[PDB]
Design a protein around this nucleic acid. Structure first.
Lengths: 46, 110, 120, 56
RNA sequence: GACGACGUUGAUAGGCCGGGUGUGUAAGCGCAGCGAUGCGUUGAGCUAACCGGUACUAAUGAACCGUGAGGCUUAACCU
RNA sequence: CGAAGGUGUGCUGUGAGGCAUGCUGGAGGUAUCAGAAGUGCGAAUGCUGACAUAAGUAACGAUAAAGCGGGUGAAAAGCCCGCUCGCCGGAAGACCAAGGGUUCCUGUCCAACGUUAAUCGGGGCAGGGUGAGUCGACCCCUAAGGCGAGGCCGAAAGGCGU
RNA sequence: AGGACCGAACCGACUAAUGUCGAAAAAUUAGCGGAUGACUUGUGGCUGGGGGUGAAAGGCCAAUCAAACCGGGAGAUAGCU
RNA sequence: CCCGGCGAGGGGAGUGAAAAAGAACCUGAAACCGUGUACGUACAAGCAGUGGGAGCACGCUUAGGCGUGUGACUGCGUACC
RNA sequence: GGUUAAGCGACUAAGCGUACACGGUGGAUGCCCUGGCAGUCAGAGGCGAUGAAGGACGUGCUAAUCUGCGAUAAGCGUCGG
């Protein structure tokens, strides 16, 4: 079947990327919670 | 004088090695080598490779006599498991556990 | 229910079955011995013994007859050209089956087929 | 296809009363070579009723 | 798995010769036709399991489990 | 010259228990009398770890197809070669973008992985290989569209936008 | 010329089978409807939970939809096991 | 050092207080799984126990008979929450 | 002593049951700590455009990862202990 995750890096980057999530203040809290919860991989990097 | 040989973690199950190592209970060695050279199985690859290693432990460490040399006890006992995951249908898995077994061969002159 | 039938199926379709027994009988006379399982040994016999039967009384037409059933003239070259005086007197069987033993691959009853007259 | 009440290890044993491997003790000795093969079979060195039958 | 037939004092299987059966005029030559093809050879040839024989090959000497006159008591017959 | 714990044993109390002791064990335990509670488990389709059962049953993943000889090797229906057989051929062929990121290749190894064995493998150990003024991007130019200097607008964030 | 005809690709899902502890959390073989249109596909964007979007089935919104999912109120509450 | 596939695994030897401390390593219970010895068992049915009990097998005392194991057969008896 | 009959009658155990001795899997119990929770007591109560918190990629004799550090890279100078 046409399964749901038909992936890319172009869909991925402009949605869940760094400068996307660290654009707005509501995004920024996720970057300031993934920090404080001590996650290694912040959002997506290659 | 008495001697023991063990193959530990033989990659099979207990009933698979119990069946051929039921015939060689209470036998002499040369009739046991001849009943294991022509038993068409995998455990007869297993324990006959080890039963000849037991008589080596006689001719070298214990009693060099092999002609009138008995096998007293032989008992295959269980071992660990390799718990892999098998996929069954409709999304649900299946905890397979690839079985493993231990065999002792005990050789002496009662 | 098999009652008075013959010719074991050997778990292949008839088209596959016939085409194997060609390329074993082609292989049989070229190396003079084959290892097979017991039934194929027991039923390559019922197939090959026509060939050296229909090759003692040599003709022009029987060359194609052992080419319609063989389609391998190199095997037909060994027939009729050595096998003639090799088998003048044997009114009947030409295979001495040997029960060899057991296949260490998959526990088959292995065996040995040969032509009787062996000196090499 | 299901079990409703698990059988004991007793009846599990008596089902295994007949699994025992048939012994193949009936070896043979050669006529004129003296060695030992299995009956109606050939040796490791190609002997069968005192003949080098396969020469392997 | 059992039951049955045999194991060189052998026809139990396979092969083989023959017959039987089934399909129909094999192939290869020669003739008639520019040719497809038709005629002769030729009711030929080929023929699964069928039937009757022939030991040609495969069914070996052994080895093996099974023993070594069968308990007690009474009655009836042996002397 | 042997603590707790474990495992049997003889005794003892109305029971919850206690006391002595054989073996295993190898460094801690605790009387009498009192103080405080994460204080006593069979259940709750309780949670977690482990092990049975069905069972040596079912199944081995398309009904394209094998068969033979040789070799390597401790062992070969499956690995390497040769010989035929069979299957695909607007594909089960060969290139590219996406997407995966050593999965390619030689030496070497079989514990584990490969729904089997395995000398083989897209598996592990080790080393190697990707070479562009023209190929694609990066780069110069915009669409849909997202931000958005001044600004308009809005409790605050922020929304729209040149 | 055709929202024209026949029929592959592409697409869709009608009928039966099989499967339904599946080879698959919706498939495979045999057919079936269309196939220059109101079509089909790729890539890149925009819309948002009482809100999106809908040739309207309460269908679809990451296998879940008569109000998605994560966290937070919150150890809600439970005359009920 | 022997045997094995110059594998795994294992038996000796050596260290060490001990390898029934060996890298899956202190201690190592239970379920589950086998080995051996002893007894019962293939005409008997049924919550599988309890009351009675022959024979056999053993540790012993003291030789009179207890203890432990099994337990033919028999009287009652339909698990727990 | 032998013979026919009649009555009665163990050892057989493919496996299975129970108890002991033996390990087999298993990793609970007792014991252990450089691990963590709750606080007493002072001190601090900030880091940040002479570039942060949190990361990427490099640095050694080195393959890798952790600690430290940053083309001066497990470290430099400097004044002391």
């Amino acid at each position: 079947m046409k399964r749901t995750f038909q992936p890319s890096v172009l869909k991925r980057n402009r949605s869940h990327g760094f400068r996307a999530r660290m654009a707005t203040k509501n995004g920024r809290q996720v970057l300031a919670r993934r920090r404080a919860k001590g996650r290694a991989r912040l959002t997506v990097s290659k | 004088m008495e001697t023991i040989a063990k193959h530990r973690h033989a990659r099979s199950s207990a009933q698979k090695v119990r069946l051929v190592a039921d015939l060689i209970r209470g036998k002499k060695v040369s009739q046991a080598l001849d009943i294991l050279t022509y038993t068409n199985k995998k455990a007869a690859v297993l324990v006959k490779k080890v039963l000849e290693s037991a008589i080596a432990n006689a001719e070298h460490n214990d009693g060099a006599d092999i002609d009138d040399l008995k096998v007293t006890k032989i008992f295959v006992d269980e071992g660990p498991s390799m718990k892999r995951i098998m996929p069954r249908a409709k999304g649900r898995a299946d905890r397979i556990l690839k079985r493993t077994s231990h065999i002792t061969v005990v050789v002496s002159d009662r | 229910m098999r009652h008075r039938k013959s010719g074991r199926q050997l778990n292949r379709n008839s088209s596959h079955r016939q085409a194997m027994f060609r390329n074993m009988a082609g292989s049989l006379v070229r190396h003079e011995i084959i290892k097979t399982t017991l039934p194929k040994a027991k039923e390559l016999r019922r197939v090959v013994e026509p060939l050296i039967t229909l090759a003692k009384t040599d003709s022009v037409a029987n060359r194609r007859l052992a080419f319609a059933r063989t389609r391998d003239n190199e095997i037909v070259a060994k027939l009729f050209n050595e096998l003639g005086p090799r088998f003048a007197s044997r009114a009947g069987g030409y295979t001495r089956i040997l029960k060899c033993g057991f296949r260490a691959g998959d526990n088959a009853p292995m065996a040995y087929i040969e032509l009787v007259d062996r000196s090499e | 296809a299901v079990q409703q009440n698990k059988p004991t290890r007793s009846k599990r044993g008596m089902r295994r009363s007949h699994d025992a491997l048939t012994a193949v003790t009936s070896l043979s000795v050669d006529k004129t070579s003296g060695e030992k093969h299995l009956r109606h079979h050939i040796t490791a060195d190609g002997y069968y009723r005192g003949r080098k039958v396969i020469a392997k």
